[PDB]
């Protein structure tokens, strides 16, 4: 009752939060494990993720070791203002959002030997750039990177509190990805070098890989049909000269159409991806399939059919002939070697 | 040992009055500023304004903070900011800005014992890059950002660069969308005014932008119907049928490119040469079909017309696109 | 002490992570050090604090820096670059490899 009152009053007699743990003497050792509660969408037009996690850092201060009742000590969060903290950061943190609602979602707690725990609720949009080289068959790593602002090499050290595949905990329904699939996760520390000195970064990596499905039914099937479609005019007969133009010009408007709305579905990029390929050609071969047309026409003497009942009708053009088999052979090894190509990576 | 840091700190804030200068009776201070560039993102067009996030450092000497018996750099709490003198130092291009708050206030200030003072900040800034886009999208741009002293003049207060063109670190690992980075300057510069001159550093980058996706999307697709447009040349002109049908489906599509090249690429309100070259192959389609519909009119209200314009369309075609390419390459 | 290079054309790697790595004689392939877009070094356990790994992102190359050599280390050391796809150290996840070099230590 009363002695909890006094032991708090007591604690902060005399301690300078300006100066970290140990000043001089040791290196303050921070152990740190993080429980992700969602990762959050993956925006690819901004190149960056948001995750909820469970920010726990562990460490000890000598300082404020305490003799009483109570084993542990439960710090309000005005409180907990008033005593050394580390300033861990997310070096590709864009934008975080420390919740405080109802109230801060924070708890900082104390064992009677002085060794505190921090745990914090939070809310982190980082930076995650992507090679779209290879879209929509792509795969990234999106990093999440954090350590000490302030504090060098030499001074504070960060570890992970378990085995570090074991200490970032990622949550079963924690996925909330509609494009990609969470196969895992990497756990890592490393050394940067800044202007201001050597210091210690903890990197976790997540890895996603794109879904296809959805560009395989809305892009590459109807692309596809479009492009059989168009060499489809080959087996018309040439004296129809305006059905065989309207089909060609047709063809050529319907795959404009699907390459403008394909390009619709893909973030602004300036460089050129496997889809924009595919689509190129799909565009190729429409416009050969009608330039080849033209050329079957330019050399048609006769502008009559030969009729059921059977005068001199024209023969089948060996273009038509030739056309009928290289368009199919050339697009269908187009197609084995862009999937080949890209599948196999 | 710490006890005896801990007084070291509060003598070196025991009167110490955070409304004046270091030498506040003499000569200016000198700031020395690097910046670490971590990334550019956003780099919008509309708004003609880029978002960067850096860390922007300052150095300077202040020997009201100076103290001996300590071999060692004191790094402290970055609250102590609140209680030491820092150079009002703002972007004059800044639009919108912040510095960053997790889990703490993204700032260090570490001490010297000669009396340097480090004083770091983490800002993400969005800077003001008025862009001129009548080259688009064969264009390069020219984006700064300005930093300046709010109310001290150059007898007060001086910038520099500290470590020369060293300065600025991280340019050459920024990957932009579409945009891809050149070179960097840096400008060390005095405004000179009746009042007094005031001092100006000015970072800025040349961006080049990548022109791969515009030659697939853009350029080829219209090329591509202009020479189908042509085709109509080679068909008997009594296919009223397949000639009219090819010519207006032509034009159709060509409307149906610029339409939409007009609602994906940025809102750009003036006269590009992206829309120059869209307009001038909507201009090729349309005399392609007036061709037709004069061919007719002179056979029915002929082989001549039609050999004359098979090679005077690809001809013409040919050098407007010699021509355009030579202007803006 | 010993500097190896690793020149690297073709492809800018400046949002690659370029990485070391060093195969004994018939063992295996071992993780040596690495270094992604943000210039987090990665080392590993046996050289760590001995070797060092530095980018030029302007030349486009990667460096290494060899102390306190030991006969231990007599093997080939190659060059990789990738996106580090499924942890960044096993050698699965690298694409581009250098043909790469032969180091002999005698004493």
């Known amino acids: 009752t009363t002695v909890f009152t006094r032991i708090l009053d007591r604690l902060l007699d005399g301690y300078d939060n300006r100066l970290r743990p140990g000043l001089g003497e040791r290196v303050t050792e921070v152990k740190t494990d993080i429980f992700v509660t969602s990762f959050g969408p993956v925006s690819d037009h901004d190149m960056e993720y948001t995750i909820d996690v469970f920010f726990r850092q562990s460490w000890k201060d000598e300082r404020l070791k305490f003799k009483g009742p109570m084993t542990v000590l439960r710090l309000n969060n005005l409180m907990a203002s008033k005593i050394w903290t580390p300033d861990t950061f997310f070096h590709n943190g864009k934008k975080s959002v420390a919740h405080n609602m109802t109230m801060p979602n924070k708890l900082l707690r104390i064992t009677e030997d002085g060794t505190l725990l921090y745990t914090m609720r939070l809310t982190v949009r980082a930076e995650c750039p992507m090679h779209l080289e290879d879209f929509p068959m792509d795969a990234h790593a999106c990093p999440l990177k954090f350590g000490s602002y302030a504090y060098t090499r030499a001074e504070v050290v960060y570890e992970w509190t378990r085995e570090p595949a074991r200490s970032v905990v990622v949550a079963e329904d924690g996925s909330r990805l509609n494009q990609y699939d969470l196969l895992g996760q990497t756990v890592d520390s490393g050394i940067v070098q800044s202007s201001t000195g050597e210091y210690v970064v903890m990197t976790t990596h997540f890895h996603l890989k794109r879904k296809i499905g959805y560009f395989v039914i809305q892009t590459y099937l109807p692309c596809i049909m479009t492009v059989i479609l168009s060499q489809v005019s080959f087996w018309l007969n040439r004296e129809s000269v305006p059905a065989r133009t309207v089909f060609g010009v047709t063809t050529v408007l319907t795959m404009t159409t699907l390459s403008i709305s394909a390009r619709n579905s893909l973030p602004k990029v300036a460089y050129a991806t496997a889809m924009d390929w595919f689509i190129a050609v799909c565009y190729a071969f429409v416009f050969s399939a009608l330039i080849e047309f033209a050329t079957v026409n330019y050399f048609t003497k006769r502008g009559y059919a030969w009729d059921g009942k059977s005068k001199t009708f024209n023969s089948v053009s060996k273009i038509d002939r030739l056309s009928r088999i290289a368009f199919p052979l050339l697009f269908g090894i187009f197609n084995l070697v862009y999937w080949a190509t890209y599948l196999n990576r | 040992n710490m006890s005896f840091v801990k007084e070291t700190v509060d003598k070196l804030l025991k009167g110490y009055d955070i409304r004046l200068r270091p030498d506040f009776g003499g000569p200016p201070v000198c700031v020395g500023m690097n910046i670490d560039i971590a990334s550019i993102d956003m780099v919008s067009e509309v708004n003609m304004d880029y978002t960067l996030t850096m860390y922007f450092q300052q150095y300077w000497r202040d020997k009201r903070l100076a103290y001996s018996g300590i071999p060692l750099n004191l790094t402290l709490d970055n609250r102590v900011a609140d209680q030491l003198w820092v150079p009002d130092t703002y972007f004059l291009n800044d639009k919108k800005s912040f510095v960053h708050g997790v889990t703490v206030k993204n700032r260090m200030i570490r001490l010297h014992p000669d009396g340097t003072v480090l004083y770091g900040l983490r800002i993400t800034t969005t800077a003001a890059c008025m862009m001129d886009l009548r080259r688009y999208p064969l264009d390069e741009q020219n984006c700064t950002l300005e930093i300046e002293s709010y109310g001290y003049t150059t007898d007060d207060i001086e910038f520099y660069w500290r470590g020369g063109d060293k300065a600025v670190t991280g340019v050459e690992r920024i990957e932009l969308p579409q945009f891809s980075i050149v070179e960097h300057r840096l400008v060390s510069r005095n405004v000179v005014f009746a009042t007094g001159a005031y001092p100006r550093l000015s970072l800025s980058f040349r961006l080049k932008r990548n022109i791969g996706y515009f030659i697939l999307q853009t350029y080829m697709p219209s090329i591509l119907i202009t020479i189908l447009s042509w085709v109509s040349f080679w068909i008997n002109y009594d296919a009223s049928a397949a000639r009219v049908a090819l010519g207006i489906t032509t034009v159709l599509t060509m409307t149906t490119i610029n339409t939409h090249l007009r609602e994906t690429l940025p809102k750009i309100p003036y006269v590009k040469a992206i829309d120059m070259y869209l307009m001038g192959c909507f201009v090729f389609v349309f005399l392609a079909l007036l061709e037709y519909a004069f061919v007719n009119y002179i056979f029915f209200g002929v082989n001549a017309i039609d050999r004359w314009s098979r090679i005077v369309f690809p001809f013409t075609f040919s050098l407007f696109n010699l021509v355009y390419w030579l202007y803006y390459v | 002490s010993l500097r190896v290079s690793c020149a690297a054309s073709?492809?800018?790697?400046?949002?690659?992570?370029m990485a070391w790595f060093r195969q004994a004689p018939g063992k295996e392939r071992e993780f040596l050090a690495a270094?992604?877009?943000?210039?987090?070094?990665y080392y590993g356990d046996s050289v760590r604090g001995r070797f060092t790994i530095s980018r030029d992102y302007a030349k486009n190359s990667v460096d290494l820096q060899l102390d306190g050599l030991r006969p231990e280390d007599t093997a080939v050391y190659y060059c990789?670059?990738?996106?580090?796809?499924?942890?960044?150290?096993?050698?699965?996840?690298?694409?581009?490899w250098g043909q790469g070099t032969q180091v002999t230590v005698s004493s």
């Open positions: 073709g492809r800018t790697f400046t949002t690659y992570i």
């Open positions: 990789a670059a990738g996106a580090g796809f499924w942890g960044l150290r096993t050698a699965s996840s690298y694409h581009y």
């Open positions: 270094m992604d877009q943000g210039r987090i070094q």
